[PDB]
Design a protein around this ligand. Structure first.
Ligand SMILES: O=C(c1ccc2[nH]ncc2c1)N1CCC2(CC1)C(=O)N(Cc1nc(C3CC3)no1)CN2c1ccccc1
Length: 294
């Protein structure tokens, strides 16, 4: 059942993509449509809508139709959700919740750790942000779904520090420095990648755990610094080789200022050479949710 396209009212542009756009839209007369949405009375219902340009290539339309298939199965509080589609006619549309605070890298960058002595954020809230990401990945693991590009730039933030995992792709200018590009090869977020992904292209739930470790390091750094930021792309790839050789010469991300040694030891577990020794997301969530409880 197509969402009624006529009820979508443009407001502003959230994203310029290569073959489409993401727009912020209001939903005209929202009460008629509620079954999958929830709207407070007398307030504007805002949604994000990904629209395929109606003259986009056949390749682009194919990729869009597959993304609809993938999005359709995602049903978890910490993964973005498909509210509806308009695909029986053109332009093809997907609809999702509006997350008013944008991506998590930009959001956290504007905050400082609160000073007990005295926009800020507390240590327990940082853990709450991290645990929501772990819960989202826990869900994806039960689907045997491998993300392949977990990073704070790919998470969205709503009200009250709620987090949802997304996947923007790798084309945004703002994050060009986070990807390694070689002609004729896949574009690769090497600073977030397990050693076996870099050397063999093997992406698994276990390499998603490695990437979660880096993502947790980002959060505890308040997104103030790039992983391995003082090293070149070449040195990061060479480091992957040192994990393989296993002669004690591989290096790790350092402990953030806001990060206690216990939590750092969890990050190091996420970066275990052997993929089967890395913790499952069910245990990562538990650790982080306990600590954030008090
Ligand atoms: O530009 C934005 C954006 C910016 C600011 C915003 N604030 N509030 C909302 C919002 C949206 N994007 C984020 C959402 C987006 C398009 C890019 C996306 O990363 N998609 C692919 C995807 N795959 C997965 C699976 C791994 C879980 N999750 O997402 C699909 N997806 C999307 C967007 C709109 C409707 C339907 C899908």
């Amino acid at each position: 059942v197509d969402f009624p396209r006529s009820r979508l009212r443009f407001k502003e542009k959230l994203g310029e993509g290569q073959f489409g756009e993401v727009h912020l839209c209001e939903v005209d007369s929202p009460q008629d449509l509620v079954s999958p949405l929830n709207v407070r009375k007398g307030h504007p219902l805002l949604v994000a809508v990904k629209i395929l340009r109606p003259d986009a290539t056949k390749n682009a339309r194919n990729d869009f139709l597959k993304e609809v298939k993938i999005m359709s199965r995602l049903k978890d509080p910490n993964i973005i959700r498909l509210l509806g589609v308009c695909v029986q006619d053109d332009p093809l549309c997907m609809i999702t919740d509006y997350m008013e605070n944008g991506d998590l890298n930009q959001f956290l960058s504007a905050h400082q750790l609160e000073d007990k002595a005295a926009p800020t954020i507390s240590y327990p809230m940082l853990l709450h942000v991290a645990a929501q990401i772990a819960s989202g990945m826990r869900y994806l693991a039960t689907l045997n779904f491998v993300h392949r590009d977990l990073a704070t730039r790919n998470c969205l933030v709503g009200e009250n520090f709620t987090i949802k995992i997304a996947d923007f792709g790798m084309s945004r200018n703002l994050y060009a420095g986070d990807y390694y590009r070689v002609q004729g090869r896949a574009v690769l977020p090497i600073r977030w990648m397990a050693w076996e992904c870099i050397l063999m292209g093997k992406f698994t739930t276990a390499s998603d755990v490695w990437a979660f470790g880096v993502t947790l390091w980002e959060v505890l750094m308040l997104c103030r610094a790039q992983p391995f930021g003082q090293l070149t792309d070449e040195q990061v790839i060479e480091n992957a080789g040192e994990f393989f050789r296993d002669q004690g010469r591989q290096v790790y991300l350092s402990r953030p200022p806001a990060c206690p040694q216990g939590l750092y030891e969890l990050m190091l577990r996420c970066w275990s050479r052997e993929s089967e020794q890395r913790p499952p997301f069910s245990q990562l969530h538990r650790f982080l949710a306990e600590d954030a409880l008090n």
